[PDB]
């Protein structure tokens, strides 16, 4: 009912199993083939991607005046690397 | 045809001698191995093709590939091919609408240099000031003559080059604007063998969209001296769609030009061509969706007099579009306000066509027009139709 | 016995938005020539004498028709809601009305430029990104995190006149 | 309507949803259901204002517009009897 996520930096988050289903990589890693480690991933990048999970599940198939999801320009390259790894 | 030993690719070359290898390749491909011969230089063409194919890759890849010292070689490289002697027309009486387009011989290699030019003008750095000394007024002057080409594929690539030069080079804006005015002024009254004006007019569309407000005297003279008389072109059938847009867009800037435009439009009215009038009516119809009611108070007599002339036409299509005028919403709103003056002009002609034409479809719409004017101050209609019948009684007296 | 009828969904708009749409569609059909396979249909070709214009957009072997309508509710009064719009998708006599937020998404599949397959990979090592997106109204959904991150690092350009949007056409603003 | 919450201490965090009029018991029941540790042995935290068992968002002043699926409200967690506020910040860019 909750999957535990460990940041390579040394942070650990936990997010519902339903919320995690929206990402292909973790589902393939876990559904079929507990603990998952996102090695190299900094703490803040993991926090932002998980916040994106919450956002997407909340604002999925529904199409309303959903707001923008801010990403400061200085924090962009590492988020892109994380997204490419996870998606 | 000196032997072209395949030099190591820039991927294998280290940081050093990279420009020297790059520059040497540009001098290597500066040659003019002609493609008119059916079978010759069977090995020289592909290595030249491979180098250009790799050259396009080289510019797109990496960032610091382009350096100041290379600027001269690229311009010499590009100018050696694009500034060619254009082949003479196969047929002086060639029909752009009917005859198939003429192809180009060196196109397989030309496709790469124009691509090389395009990805170079759009390069990440491209300091224009460095290129200001090298891309001078002489480079642009010969570039315009290339629009006279006959291959349609080349014109589209050529147009994107001109827009890139104008949008980046802040120095030759006056020259290219003056050149654009000069080259058009020839096409209105001269031999007029130009064939790329359809692509040329596309640039004019994006140059007037930037015309700052209020207008200047130089921009004012553009309309009455260049654009408006262009409707007298022999081949308007292919340039009208782009020519109609710029007139409307330019009008939308300063609305005070509506009166000169409409009167100017009515001066060069088509006389003997049915197809010319059909698209011409579409020009006036478009204007009326942006016209101001006050500006209507100055063109009721001349504009509507022509429309009352074209309804009594010998061709259905000319009458068909004109009869569709009484179907718009803004047009009907305008004619309701000034019904007192519009009605006496049309009604003499709208009633005559009611019982003389053969096709019921044209007559069917006419009934809708006459019934529409009954949805107005019909006392004037009653005053008309009582007097008008007396004028037809006066015409009955003419019969008598 | 009552007569038979057809029922449509029509979005009520003001004429300034209609004429702006006509200007934008024409400019990008003809002048800049990005949307060249689109068709623009004048009012004198449909039986219903309220259609103001039709735009047909080929989508592969399907098509999408956006129809504008002139005076409905008009006649004296005023022109806040003189015109109207409807959107239809037809294939082999089959038709369904589509929300604009989905109509714009469907147009963008067979049309303008978006990031290619290697754009993401080449962003990593800085080997320049090309082509880059010029139509941000076609990504109104959430989409993958990759697109959102990428759009941040290369802010797309702005077409000189605005790119034509089905969403700008159908927006109230009057009532908010 | 619903809001989203942040609870941070040491190297653990939780992402969760609840209803609007929920006072504090629904949040405490969820974390009970997640930490397998009896409930009252806790204290929520906001700034420095004390959090009570019956406190509610509206009374608390937190509103739907305060917590969005892009920056959820942070309140931390606590459990032996009492501990300090170990709000360790996230990592920073290398600059």
């Amino acid at each position: 009912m909750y999957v535990k996520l460990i940041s390579s930096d040394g942070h650990e988050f936990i997010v519902k199993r339903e919320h995690a289903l929206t990402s292909g990589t973790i589902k393939a890693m876990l559904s079929g083939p507990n603990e998952v480690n996102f090695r190299e991933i900094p703490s803040h990048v993991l926090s932002k991607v998980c916040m994106y999970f919450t956002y997407k599940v909340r604002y999925t198939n529904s199409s309303t005046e959903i707001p923008e999801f801010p990403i400061a320009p200085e924090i962009a390259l590492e988020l892109l690397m994380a997204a490419n790894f996870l998606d | 045809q000196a032997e072209l030993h395949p030099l190591p690719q820039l991927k294998d070359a280290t940081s050093n001698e990279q420009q020297e290898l790059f520059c040497q390749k540009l001098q290597q491909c500066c040659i003019l191995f002609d493609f008119m011969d059916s079978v010759s230089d069977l090995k020289s063409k592909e290595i030249k093709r491979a180098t250009l194919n790799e050259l396009v890759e080289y510019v797109s890849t990496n960032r610091g590939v382009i350096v100041e010292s290379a600027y001269s070689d690229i311009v010499k490289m590009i100018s050696a091919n694009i500034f060619r002697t254009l082949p003479p027309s196969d047929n002086p009486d060639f029909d752009p609408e009917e005859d198939e387009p003429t192809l180009e011989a060196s196109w397989p290699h030309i496709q790469l240099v124009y691509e090389f030019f395009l990805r170079f003008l759009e390069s990440p750095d491209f300091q224009p000031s460095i290129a200001k000394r090298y891309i001078d007024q002489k480079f642009v002057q010969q570039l315009l003559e290339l629009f006279d080409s006959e291959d349609p594929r080349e014109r589209d690539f050529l147009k994107t080059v001109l827009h890139r030069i104008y949008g980046k080079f802040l120095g030759l804006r006056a020259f290219i604007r003056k050149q654009i005015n000069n080259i058009f002024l020839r096409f209105i009254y001269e031999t007029e063998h130009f064939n790329g004006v359809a692509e040329l007019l596309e640039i004019l569309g994006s140059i007037i969209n930037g015309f700052a407000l209020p207008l200047k005297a130089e921009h004012k003279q553009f309309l009455m001296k260049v654009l408006i008389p262009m409707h007298t072109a022999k081949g308007l059938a292919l340039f009208h769609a782009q020519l109609a847009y710029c007139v409307v867009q330019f009008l939308e800037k300063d609305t005070t030009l509506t009166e000169p435009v409409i009167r100017g439009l009515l001066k060069f009215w088509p006389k003997t061509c049915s197809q010319k009038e059909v698209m011409f009516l579409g020009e006036i119809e478009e204007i009326l969706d942006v016209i101001e009611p006050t500006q209507f108070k100055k063109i009721e007599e001349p504009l509507f007099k022509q429309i009352s002339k074209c309804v009594s036409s010998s061709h259905f299509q000319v009458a068909e579009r004109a009869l569709y005028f009484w179907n718009n919403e803004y047009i009907l709103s305008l004619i309701e306000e000034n019904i007192d003056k519009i009605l006496p002009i049309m009604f003499a002609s709208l009633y005559k066509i009611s019982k003389e034409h053969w096709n019921p479809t044209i007559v069917a719409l006419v009934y809708n027009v006459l019934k529409t004017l009954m949805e107005m101050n019909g006392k004037l209609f009653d005053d008309l139709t009582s007097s008008y019948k007396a004028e037809r009684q006066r015409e009955k007296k003419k019969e008598l | 016995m009552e007569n038979r009828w057809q029922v449509m969904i029509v979005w009520q708009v003001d004429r300034m938005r209609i004429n702006t749409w006509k200007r934008l569609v024409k400019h990008h059909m003809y002048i800049s020539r990005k949307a060249k396979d689109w068709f623009y249909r004048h009012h004198y070709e449909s039986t219903n004498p309220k259609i103001s214009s039709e735009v047909h957009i080929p989508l592969g072997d399907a098509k999408l028709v956006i129809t504008t309508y002139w005076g409905l509710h008009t006649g004296e009064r005023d022109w806040h809601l003189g015109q109207g719009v409807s959107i239809e998708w037809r294939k082999k006599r089959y038709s369904t009305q589509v929300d604009p937020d989905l109509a714009d998404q469907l147009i963008h599949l067979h049309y303008f430029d978006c990031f290619s397959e290697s754009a993401i990979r080449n962003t990593i090592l800085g080997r320049i990104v090309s082509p880059r997106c010029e139509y941000q109204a076609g990504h109104n959904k959430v989409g993958s995190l990759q697109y959102l991150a990428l759009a941040a690092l290369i802010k797309p350009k702005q077409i000189k006149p605005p790119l034509p949007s089905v969403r700008k056409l159908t927006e109230d603003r009057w009532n908010k | 309507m619903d809001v989203f919450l942040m609870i941070r201490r040491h190297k653990t965090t939780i992402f969760t949803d609840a209803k609007e009029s929920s006072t504090v018991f629904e949040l405490k029941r969820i974390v009970e259901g997640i930490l397998k540790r009896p409930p009252d042995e806790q204290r929520l935290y906001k700034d420095d204002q004390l959090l009570d068992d019956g406190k509610t968002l509206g009374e608390c002043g937190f509103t739907s517009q305060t917590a969005r699926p892009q920056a959820p409200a942070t309140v931390g967690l606590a459990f032996d009897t009492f501990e300090a506020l170990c709000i360790e910040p996230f990592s920073s860019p290398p600059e």
Binding site: - | - | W5, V7, E76, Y94, T96, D101, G143, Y147 | -
Partner: protein, 146 residues
């Protein structure tokens, strides 16, 4: 059985949640002429099958338009005297639905609601349903082959 899923999406979809959740509607007429004239014109239009009829959410941009078929629906009036009953089948976003409404001519407003139409799903065509679903399932991003 994807229609039940579409209906379930009632809570989570914009386009079943903005026009099928109990919303007050009014007939949008000339709006200028005096009230008695408005009622007369509306009633004349309701009998005669030569006109246009407009319905407003009273507060939105959405309107329902009934056009004459010349340019299983009906506009019944005798039932429940002083009421007009509106029934309109449609296909919305790929799912076949039925629109039912009623207007009181004294006040020129009333109530409308939207419901699912059963039976009418398997006879049209499986291929068009699947094609539209597949079309709407695609994403442009990272799709082009360079």
């Amino acid at each position: 059985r994807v229609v039940p899923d579409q209906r379930s999406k009632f809570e989570n979809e914009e386009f079943f949640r903005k026009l099928s959740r109990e919303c007050e509607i009014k007939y949008t007429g000339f709006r200028d002429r005096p009230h008695e004239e408005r009622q007369a014109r509306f009633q004349n239009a309701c009998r005669d099958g030569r006109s246009e009829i407009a319905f407003v959410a009273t507060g939105t941009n959405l309107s329902l338009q009934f056009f004459p078929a010349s340019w299983r629906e009906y506009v019944d009036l005798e039932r429940e005297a002083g009421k007009v009953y509106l029934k309109a089948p449609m296909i919305l976003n790929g799912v076949c639905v039925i629109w039912k409404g009623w207007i009181d001519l004294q006040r020129l407003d009333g109530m409308g609601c939207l419901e699912f139409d059963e039976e009418r799903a398997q006879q049209e065509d499986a291929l068009a349903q699947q094609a539209f679903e597949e079309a709407r399932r695609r994403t442009r991003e990272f799709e082009d082959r360079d």
